[model samples]
Target: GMTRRIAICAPSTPFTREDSARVIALAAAEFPDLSLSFHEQCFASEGHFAGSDALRLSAFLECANDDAFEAVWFVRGGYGANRIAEDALARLGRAASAKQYLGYSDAGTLLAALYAHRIGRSVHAPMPVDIRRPEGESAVRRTLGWLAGAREGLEPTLGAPAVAFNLMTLAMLCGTRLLPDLSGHVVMIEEVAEHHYAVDRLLFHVTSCLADAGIAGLRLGRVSDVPENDRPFGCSVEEMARHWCHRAGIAFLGTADIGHDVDNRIVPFG
Candidate 1:
């Protein structure tokens, strides 16, 4: 098996076959050694999720637990993964430990769970779905490049043992069984589509809860799409971060180059 087969599954929301085909074509044309397999469940649509919880669970396991796949690349993220995360982890076999699981946003729930169990390499990076955005080909290429052992797509500033997550996703997983022990690890967090106040609130919760985890520091990634409230939240995102970090006795480690857009960079959890 000279080809590296990466299973493309939709653990959060459905992915159109068109999008899948484009990504497959790109990989085949530019990365001759890489194979992207879009699982049937990626096209399964059930209300807000890619499929029923049962189906998503089985599909994820099929990809993760299969020895044939070198990596499990989530197609997109919206909101369904938390429902299946714990149960999915419980059923993962030894094969699951040998692959890299990649995605961000809603998929972070599963990423967090996987990291907690230390099952595999959990990476926060661009997914196949990003091919649809403007200049998105570059984003998709970055993902493929990283998967193929090229370091150009990686966040250049990452320290060893650092982990990244969507801000809100990390907040929701706090105090849950899914959250990993981040002690001595630098945490990089980003967000999209929240008000300044909401970002502040999320940081408040994250710092307060994780403060005792003895994390080395916190890094703020691009918090895109912060809609203005009727009035202002009265502070910038960095100020909010500094406020919370200082209050929690955690160090604020400055900005990171990641977000929900085409410019997002790969951050591998170690």
Candidate 2:
């Protein structure tokens, strides 16, 4: 069997070694042709991060610079990636330009920078931590299958040269150097554990920042785990999106099959 080597590392948050064992076992059972290797730094801990910014940056550089790996898969997501993404990409060598980088949630920090820098393939898709969810097996399978060259798990409505990100992550990147020039590209976004008001606010911010970028349109993905705010936000997430898109003169495209759950589909960046 021809093997596709995928190197795994946790730049945002560390997952347990037990989780790695579970992912490794599943890969062996269903995707033996794809070799999955987890970097030791994925299990390293320092405060809430996988390790210190230095350790995380070193581990990412090690994997991305290694020509043996065809892809670099992020293992988990939390809130530390923004601390190291700039440095990590700045230090990446030519070998990194040939790899596919996949993950979502806070990993969007790195994905945005990667797409901005035109390093490698940056995709928003399910990660190893999703294996802990219900129907997690299929989620992992979808990811490995895509890495194995299957397109069945891609967002069916995805237009060419599109990108996806967590709504908040994309909003935060709006004024930063990490945000790519998304001209002529559809931008899909999703969120989790946020209030409806927060979602609306993010949409407002994103649409305003992207107004002059000449993007094709914006599509809303599942906004899951929304908590009850002190008062109702009056508008649904779709309504919020439509309002902002209208205000910014951007088209309001249809929904997308992506989010913080196991059913999240791949949305690749240009």
Candidate 3:
């Protein structure tokens, strides 16, 4: 085990002590040497942010600059990362340092910013709370390998290339200034508790924007728990992907391991 200090913060919402403790215990089990600590002010606001923009921004800045910390891991993904993106970027100096920022889902916003501004490497890995789930072994092993620098030569687990997913959060942020231009990157998307028609519409809007802008290809991930409608949406999730891919000419692949699933894997977006 190495002495690299690890810092854990809730950049989206404040979790209960029980939740935090659960994540810490799980992380400790996987990484006995990881020194995990939390930011007191990191919590969610009534609206879209984990906390006040200032508080979230300040806490992340402090954690990034803490010499004792080698990597910063987000506790969970929610709606606040986009709210604090510009603020956090402005405070943290440009230039990619040795620091590592890790998270997924709404954390994609932060990952995009780090890639955009050329800051430290941001990992698209599992959030802390995801560690305790049954399907979390592959993700946990991948994370530990990344931390230990064991897994090299990144490749997709299946033919489907690794891409990031944010489900409802990504859909809500799309068409706004908050969404990053992720063209050329194999992108994965999913949703929960949404009508099938709505999923199609969101996919249309996102793919249209990316295609019109001439970004890159797209990869489709699992889309599940869609509510039943009186009239069928006339397309399944795979059908939805085909429609978008036909129009946008982006590659589409299907998988079932992202989204609300406990075994969600984090992808590092460039």
TM-scores for candidates 1 onward, in order: 0.97, 0.97, 0.82
What stretches of model 1 exceed 4 Å from their correct place?
none
For model 3, how does the per-residue alpha-carbon lDDT over 229-250 read when each residue is reduced to its tens digit? Answer: 5487776777886798779866
TM-score, model 3 to reference:
0.82
Q: How far is 255's C-alpha from truth in model 3 (Å)?
A: 4.2
lDDT of each model, Cα atoms only? 0.90, 0.90, 0.66
In candidate 1, what are the lDDT values of residues 1-270, reduced to their tens digit? 257989988887999998888998999888889988889999999778998889999999999999999999989989879989989978999999999999989898988899998998999999888999999999999989888888988898964488899998999899999999999898999999998888889999999999899998999999987775548667789999999999999999888899999999999887
Tell how far residue 1 is off in model 1, in angstroms.
11
Off by over 4 Å in 3: 43-49, 94-96, 131-145, 150-163, 167-181, 228-230, 253-257
Worst 10 residues of 3 by lDDT: 153-162
lDDT of 2 at 138: 85
Give the clashing residue pairs of candidate 3, or none: 12-50, 14-43, 43-50, 44-50, 124-266, 124-267, 125-266, 183-216, 184-216
